[PDB]
Symmetry: C3
Subunit: 147 residues, 3 copies
């Protein structure tokens, strides 16, 4: 609908380049606009995080040219095809994407990174419960070792 | 000030829809624009993370219509009213919000998710110190068990 | 190239203020646009996270005025000069920045916070492996204590 450095904007705003924000990024999290509010399983959140594969990579020059970014800057993230098998809520199909040389990539996948970070919050909550359980099992051994 | 798919933009940029970014999101973190720099308490950061409640939810169709998003896509996040009692720095009141049916929601709350993720970084730093303390208490038991 | 509340936009989009997004932020993580895909060392990711320094701070009024943000709102983040020594992939030099009083700050540093959060994901994966190793060493002590 509104594209910066680009034509064919599927989403409300598409930025072919970097975004520099002085303030913060806000999202509507008010309860009064929600429904089907169910509790998450933090144990399942830690499992999906531990299966995820983080990679160092760089963008192909043919893609970086048509996307307004640099191919020489190192990147660190995830593979959308691998995350889709683990957390498909964080992956979307955005149709075709044409590179700078004319190569058309059909069914190009994008990733909602904030969804992964939210999953990481629940993973920390699970780690907090596991370490607290380990400290209890450690405390029984220490009290048993001084008797 | 500048709104996409929307009127009444309270903030510098309001996007009623999704944002697709090819590059990265940058923030001004230079020291020379900061003051009142105080150390954080990672122990307090882990406590606020462990109290937070992650929920699976979906947006009401009346809200999703007036916000340029879909009601059928599953979501995972936080309740702004619940985070405000835990981390009020991450919650802001944005005034009134009118749904697609005319229902006016006064004192609508938004959430800065990056503030929660930053809090999660300090929670990991606290978990790193707790597990290192547990390994020391484990190491004393193992060396005591071989004597 | 496109600036909101600002002149001199170095990047594709610069927002002097806050950004309110109804939907999600998406990034191109498709494998077919990647190269030099190497595995990350989660042990190195936990080390860089544990060295990082989180601070509470507020923006100087002279900077907040020229950036479209408030100086009275509390902030929590990182020092770009300190992160650059730890994770230089997350820091960029954006040239000169002039405050509201005329003070020119040369070599102003910005931070990609999502790069830090991605690093935090690998830190959780390392904590998951350490706690699992501690539970094994605890389990040997418990089975040895009942013989």
């Amino acid at each position: 609908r509104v594209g910066i450095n680009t034509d064919r904007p599927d989403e409300a705003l598409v930025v072919h380049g970097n975004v520099k924000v002085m303030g913060s990024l806000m999202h509507p999290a008010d309860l009064r606009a929600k429904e089907h509010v169910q509790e998450v399983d933090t144990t399942e959140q830690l499992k999906r995080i531990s299966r995820m594969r983080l990679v160092h990579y760089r963008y192909k020059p043919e893609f970086a040219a048509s996307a307004g970014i640099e191919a020489t800057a190192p990147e660190t993230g995830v593979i959308a095809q691998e995350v889709k098998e683990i957390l498909p809520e964080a992956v979307k199909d955005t149709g075709d994407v044409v590179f700078a040389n004319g190569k058309t990539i059909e069914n190009f996948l994008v990733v909602n990174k904030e969804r992964i970070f939210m999953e990481n919050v629940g993973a920390v909550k699970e780690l907090c419960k596991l370490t607290d359980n380990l400290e209890t099992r450690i405390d029984e051994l220490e009290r048993w070792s001084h008797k």
